[PDB]
């Protein structure tokens, strides 16, 4: 059950009650399509059905040629000021998958995989480097072409095939064309992993055969659409009648730990004289999850995806913080953790739509209201930072911008408190601290009060 608290003192809100699903690692499987090596199409027969087969077989050959050009390359991909995103490290997302892909280029490795998938369409193969991977055969065009299409190709006659075969071949070949299509506009690396790359049935089957926990299997199976988005498909090799590409699947090593989302908005003084005001904004907005005695913090919105009450995040775009980082929500002046803020003189109106309400920073001459669809305006905000819950409210207007609020069910709590911006003397307030903290601002103020003390 989702709950939420608004802190009037620091113009921020925390949404609690969420459960974690953090991608901590990677699982790499090798997906294969058995191809028929065919060059020639010996047939002078100008029959229309033969022509259609020839045309479809021509697309097949071009796809193979196109993929061979892609194989020649080494796979690679590249994955505000009020957020702490600039503090993040830089990972290499497909480094694990690529490492597997490189092994597949080694001679004998290809033939090794083909041997394992001879009788079955699912097997585990020991690679020459000493790594085991789940290998899968999802399509056998080699079988179909050699069994259904050989007499119309391998011989001058060329016994004209039935129309149903012409249709059937186009259906089966289509998947190869679409896979090639995706790789060719994505430089051999795609994400999310499409159903062409891996069907719902194949993915669900792959998950079940993944030697992971029953909880992980259940988790991934109930959230396939999220798993696809956190996965990569990496074109590897097309060699000796087999196309192989590496599918890089998320590994969720952290599950069902409490998560909370922190929303922040500018807190300024509200003096009538334009420009005589000072502002303060908590910059530690984003998702937080308890994780192994510490806290995983995700500054950027793209990193986390919410499904009902479960949060799917990627640890690559996170910081590991002391659990005392949560103290900034209860006591921003706590002596255990230096809470991060930014200062400014720019008092501009804006709103933050939270999980269960809306934070409104209303300043100057801005019209700020909250409304119900039936009644209309039910609350007019005064200057300063305020909050309203989603219960009874459908929209919020700040200036010329209309925000719809989330209609998620859950209780909000308004925690009254003196706006902390009122505690500072504007005469010595540093309003140029773009990336700062509580203590760093205090330090600046003490220096300013010192240079004044020297003068006095």
């Amino acid at each position: 059950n989702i709950t939420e608290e608004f802190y009037q003192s620091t113009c921020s809100a925390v949404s609690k009650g969420y459960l974690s699903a953090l991608r901590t690692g990677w699982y790499t499987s090798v997906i294969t399509i058995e191809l028929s090596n065919i060059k020639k199409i010996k047939c002078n027969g100008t029959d229309a059905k033969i022509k259609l087969i020839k045309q479809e077989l021509d697309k097949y050959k071009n796809a193979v040629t196109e993929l061979q050009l892609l194989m020649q390359s080494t796979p690679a991909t590249n994955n505000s000021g009020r957020s702490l995103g600039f503090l993040l490290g830089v990972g290499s997302a497909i480094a694990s998958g690529v490492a597997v892909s490189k092994v597949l280029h080694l001679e004998g490795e290809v033939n090794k995989i083909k041997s394992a998938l001879l009788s079955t369409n699912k097997a585990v193969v020991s690679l020459s480097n000493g790594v085991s991977v789940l290998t899968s055969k999802v399509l056998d065009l080699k079988n179909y072409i050699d069994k259904q299409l050989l007499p119309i190709v391998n011989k001058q006659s060329c016994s004209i095939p039935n129309i149903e075969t012409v249709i059937e071949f186009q259906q089966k070949n289509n998947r190869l064309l679409e896979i090639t299509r995706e790789f060719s506009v994505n430089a051999g690396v795609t994400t999310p992993v499409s159903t062409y790359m891996l069907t719902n049935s194949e993915l669900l089957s792959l998950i079940n055969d993944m030697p992971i926990t029953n909880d992980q299997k259940k988790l991934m199976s109930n959230n396939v659409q999220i798993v696809r988005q956190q996965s990569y498909s990496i074109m590897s090799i097309i060699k000796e009648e087999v196309l192989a590409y590496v599918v890089q699947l998320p590994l969720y090593g952290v599950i069902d730990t409490p998560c909370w989302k922190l929303h922040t908005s500018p807190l300024c003084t509200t003096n009538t004289k334009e420009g005589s005001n000072i502002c303060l904004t908590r910059t530690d907005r984003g998702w937080y999850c308890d994780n192994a005695g510490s806290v995983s913090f995700f500054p950027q919105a793209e990193t986390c995806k919410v499904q009902s009450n479960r949060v799917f995040c990627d640890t690559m775009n996170s910081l590991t913080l002391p659990s005392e980082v949560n103290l900034c929500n209860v006591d921003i002046f706590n002596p255990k953790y230096d809470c991060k803020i930014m200062t400014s003189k720019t008092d501009v109106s804006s709103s933050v739509i939270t999980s269960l309400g809306a934070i409104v920073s209303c300043y100057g001459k801005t019209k700020c209201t909250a409304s119900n669809k039936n009644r209309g305006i039910i609350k007019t905000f005064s200057n300063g930072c305020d909050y309203v819950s989603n219960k009874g409210v459908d929209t919020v207007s700040v200036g010329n911008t209309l925000y719809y609020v989330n209609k998620q069910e859950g209780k909000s709590l308004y925690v009254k408190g003196e706006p902390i911006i009122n505690f500072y003397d504007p005469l010595v307030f540093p309003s140029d601290q773009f990336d700062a903290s509580i203590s760093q601002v205090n330090e600046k103020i003490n220096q300013s009060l010192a240079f004044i003390r020297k003068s006095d």
Copy 2:
């Protein structure tokens, strides 16, 4: 007619003459596809045409199953330093559509919609919460399957269908497969809204039936491609022989108000001694539109899309500013509005391609020129901030970077003026104001001149 003015004094340019098309709200419609509930396919007949129908019917079932898994989840999506983007608020883009989607999950609501679309393919339905929406039936697979495909499915015989039916069913079923395909790689929420989701005919028809102004209807109909980009499709429910998804359409409450685009570039002193220079840059670049007595300001480029002379913007990514914000273009030291700037010591060369010309910030040893395709170089820029119009110029080169200029027709005006950076004493100039303003810089300078005055 587009015009443009360059202000030499502040190294910036304003492009006028544009008309507004601002998305201010949302309209939510419910799109439905009538599905045939079929499980069994009773037929032992091994006929090739039967096999093709069976295979296509199998794709149909997998799509339905796949969509049912998507329905189980709650829809969600996540929508530099020289820009003021960090000042923006945070909205919830699909909060309105999702609110409608949740209503559709309530029992009876599904049957209520199906009743309205019984005789017609277009109707308005009162939802149990008390909200009316345009509901539409775009595909009836239930009818086709039950009328054309029942004897080959519901019975052991299984009278073999004609080849044209096999083709026809694949054609009709394809749309369902593609819709499912899009939702499955987008976690149930897609944008822009594709033609699979809503065809050009259906969208145009929907717009005409939308009880909006004739101007809005005309506007949306002439710019369908833009409307699609500003729309969301939200997978809702697949229950009791009907697939329903919510299409969230833009509502343009502001039309044909004057808009202007502000371009900015660094203004530095040009002393010969490397590193002895100070820089200044207007940070209020972006789109501006008159709006309800105020000005809607769009700092980020992605927010606005230009079609000829009309600007399509989203108010969610805007600030509402006093109209006096425009005074920064005429008099940056005006006493009515504190114009936003940033300071630095980093004098690096760069160019900004405007609507009707190019701003060039040329510093140090950088080669800066403007050229015509026929003649070649026609102007060599000196150090400082300068400008050239697109009339007679095709390209501009700054260092190793070649920019093509926009060949839009329109008059440019060069407004001569002393570069304002020359007004500051470098000895007391604060060059560490990453996010500042005219008065904030003055305030810093007065403090510096005070600590000096105390010493003296």
Copy 3:
């Protein structure tokens, strides 16, 4: 051969050995599809095969109508703090292609192109403005419809076509539908250029016919997937039985010059007292390439794509810097170039995965290790900035974040040196310089030491 050096003194690493492929210009070609102008479909025959042709011909007409609406619009597109991206200029990516597209709207220009492609499918046309472009015909639906489909359309009888024709027409028409599909969700401008827009064969052929250097031809042909990603397709006109769109291809004027990638990470003091530490970070991370006596610098990761040992970059998102910018890697206090840094007090742990290793910034209580897959943990990092090569290491863990390292072959060199953060007195260290440099920090320190000197 790729090599790498880590500088302990400045917590940074440089990866050498790369070769350049910089997009410096644009080549614009005009792609055409000959369309059949057909309105009526005179046939009362209710034959199933006729019905299928009618339905497919209906899609053809809707595509044409849809494209005509797109033609009505003017094409346009819109193309952290630890990066210097905010220093970049603003170009207009499709300004060159659009300029060509505008010429195509002029009367006679359309007929001029159609005349050139009358006998051949490849020609060079002089446009009325005085610009020559490679024009190409990739599909002739006009021929097919008028030759194979006229009697079933132009007459009440309507001699029922064979089933193979029904299939064939759907195959040929499909490309038109997909092109229309892409343009309609991309407002007439697509990137990367798909195989629908331009097939692998057509693109390779176009490249060979492009009057460029043999090196460029070889370069583009071996990296087609990259070329597609650096290309635009711009819907222009559909008028007088011909659809024409402009394909904007990359021009690589700089090839095989040495490139290097600079990786940076925070360097902080490691005092036991939490918050008593000061930090310093090189902000000039990104790709560097020698270019015409200067250096092209690419701050943003998206700008450059690496294929094996060759770097594909776009000069539009670059700065042109003096070659002395490289001195920051050898001597950050060099008197020839003012190396860019940022200061802070926030000592947060993070890692940067490099080309041939990993930089680890470990601070506070963070667990920082490096591991082999077989052995496990082989190195535990102490507080400070350290480095490990990819040789023998597969993963690196910083806190709750596991990074896979790149398994690229190449030698790393560890350049020992005193961390430069140790050279600063914390009592006068400016930790609020979000965008600064070596000299700017020194200047601040000298001022602080002056106000102290006055007091003394």
